[PDB]
Ligand binder design. Structure first.
Ligand SMILES: [Mg+2]
Ligand SMILES: [Mg+2]
Lengths: 247, 260, 57
């Protein structure tokens, strides 16, 4: 039934996410000018752009995947990191949105630092450098699969989904998004999300215990490692709230 | 442009070059181009043995996209015309059908509907491996719901599979029609006229377009096929697309269970 | 006019150098592919090497 195919689909998704993975070592080993601090700056800007333009929620993580992959293969100058980020948003939007972001609007969002002709030429460079492996698995793919297995009210799945997408965006702004595969970012995001930001005593129909073990079983990890992931995500939240409020 | 072919000296296998000349505009690569080529790249990662392998995507810049594919010289129509005068042995047919179904199940599991399955685009290597060919880019093999212009999804491929399945025994197609109305008439000649509450809504031709007709025994059109293979044929040649057997289910049918 | 998300991140771009570089990178990949298959993809006609190309009507 749908159970036999859901097993197969999930097993297929876990194999697909190995093919579109960046290198955890590209700062040390490929980049000379681009530092981790600059990754966070360009990713923070990409995220604001995607949120301003009300992009589908996958555009921003998918663009970070393109960015980390291009940086695992090619040195990029500091002065062209923004151009790479705009191009990654450009291509991710085409993959995920009915009416993609326009070239002219992306250039406006760099304060006209880059020009449309440069965006189009960078798009050919990016797409060819990735050998057209553009259909990468996103954490959002795994979140929807996990949620289709959770016996919760739709009301509650909606909140869980919102929180988990917020958490996925947070991870994508940090070097965690580089080492951890999408399934693991998704699982940690979901178990963090069912904690509801510590606002209420969680009241879930599938216990947190049963969920974490279910999730660990299907993404093939130790439950200890899923809890370490969630803890990293909650530390990322704590840090970003402190950084945000101070200015 | 013109399609080229070449042998690989790393092995002895063949390779071909297709190429599309894509419309370059002010928004760069077209949406359909990046999505469709990326879908082929994603499939390629699974390395499925029953689809032609994509070897490269060579784009040159207006913008031109050239794909390098695995090439299989012989299609199934040729494989069937070379068959011994008595026909292909039953075991050979079950083997071709298993591979055909695994390849199709692979595309369906990736939300690809082939839509134009015919013996001409099912390839057979000199080693006997079946490979599906021109996906993701004559009315004889067309599912009733497509001939009726209603909603269609992956079941339309399983209807085509039933036609080809029966064709491997007959060495001549099952339903040969001149138009949609004619193709349908020949179909109902065999499987019977579907009842009223089985007819789609907002369809091109009403049910009154067709005279009343009952099902003929399905082994009248494949008398050389064993009885359980005939049961399986009927489950593919099922009018309601929601009751039609899926590729994965057909692989669990006892008729296709290899012995030992 | 300019949303706050509109900002240059890391300073001026040298645009002529950027254009030069972007076409060098791209032509380099085209050359490598043409050498990989000994096939001139730009003009769609074959070259000579491992692969003896032929048309198939
Ligand atoms: Mg265009
Ligand atoms: Mg095909």
């Amino acid at each position: 039934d749908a159970n036999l195919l859901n097993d197969r689909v999930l097993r297929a998704m876990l194999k697909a996410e190995e093919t579109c993975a960046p290198s955890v070592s590209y700062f040390k080993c490929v980049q000379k000018e681009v530092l981790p601090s600059m990754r966070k700056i360009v990713a923070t800007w990409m995220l604001e752009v995607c949120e301003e333009q009300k992009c589908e929620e996958e555009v921003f993580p998918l663009a970070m995947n393109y960015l980390d992959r291009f940086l695992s293969l090619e040195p990029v100058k500091k002065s062209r990191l923004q151009l790479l980020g705009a191009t990654c948003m450009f291509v991710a939007s085409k993959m995920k949105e009915t009416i993609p972001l326009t070239a002219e609007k992306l250039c406006i969002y760099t304060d006209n630092s880059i020009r449309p002709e440069e965006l189009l030429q960078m798009e050919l460079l990016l797409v060819n450098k990735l050998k057209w492996n553009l259909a990468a698995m996103t954490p959002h793919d795994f979140i929807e699969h996990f949620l289709s297995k959770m016996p919760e009210a739709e009301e509650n799945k909606q909140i869980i989904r919102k929180h988990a997408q917020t958490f996925v965006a947070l991870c994508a702004t940090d070097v965690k998004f580089i080492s951890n595969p999408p399934s693991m970012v998704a699982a940690g995001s979901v178990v963090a999300a069912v904690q509801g930001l510590n606002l209420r005593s969680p009241n879930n129909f599938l216990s947190y215990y049963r969920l974490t073990r279910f999730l660990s079983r299907v993404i093939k990890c130790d439950p200890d490692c899923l809890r370490a992931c969630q803890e990293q995500i909650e530390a990322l939240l704590e840090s970003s709230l402190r950084q945000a409020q101070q200015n | 442009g013109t399609v080229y072919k070449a042998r690989d000296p790393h092995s002895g296998h063949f390779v071909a070059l297709k190429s599309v000349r894509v419309p370059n505009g002010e928004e760069g690569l077209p949406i359909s181009t990046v999505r469709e080529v990326a879908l082929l790249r994603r499939l390629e990662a699974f390395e499925h043995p029953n689809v032609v392998r994509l070897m490269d995507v060579c784009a040159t810049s207006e913008i031109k996209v050239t794909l390098v594919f695995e090439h299989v010289d012989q299609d199934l129509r040729t494989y069937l015309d070379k068959a011994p005068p008595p026909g292909l042995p039953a075991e050979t047919i079950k083997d071709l059908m298993r591979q055909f179904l695994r390849g199709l199940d692979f595309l369906h599991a990736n939300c690809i509907v082939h839509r134009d399955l015919k013996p001409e685009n099912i390839l057979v290597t000199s080693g006997g491996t079946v490979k599906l060919a021109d996906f993701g880019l004559t009315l004889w093999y067309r599912a009733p719901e497509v001939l009726l212009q209603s909603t269609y999804a992956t079941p339309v491929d399983m209807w085509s599979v039933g036609c080809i399945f029966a064709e491997m025994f007959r060495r001549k197609p099952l339903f040969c029609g001149n138009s949609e109305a004619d193709q349908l008439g020949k179909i109902f000649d065999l499987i019977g006229l579907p009842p009223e509450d089985d007819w789609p809504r907002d369809v091109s031709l009403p049910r009154g377009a067709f005279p009343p007709r009952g099902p003929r025994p399905v082994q009248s059109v494949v008398p050389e096929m064993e009885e359980s293979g005939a049961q399986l044929l009927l489950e593919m040649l099922t009018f309601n697309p929601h009751k039609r057997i899926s590729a994965f289910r057909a692989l669990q049918h006892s008729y296709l269970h290899k012995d030992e | 006019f300019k949303p706050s998300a509109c900002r240059n991140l890391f300073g001026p771009v040298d645009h002529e150098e950027l254009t030069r570089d972007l076409e060098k990178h791209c032509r380099d990949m085209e050359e490598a592919s043409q050498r990989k298959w000994n096939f001139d993809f730009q003009n769609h006609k074959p070259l000579e090497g491992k692969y003896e190309w032929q048309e198939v009507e």
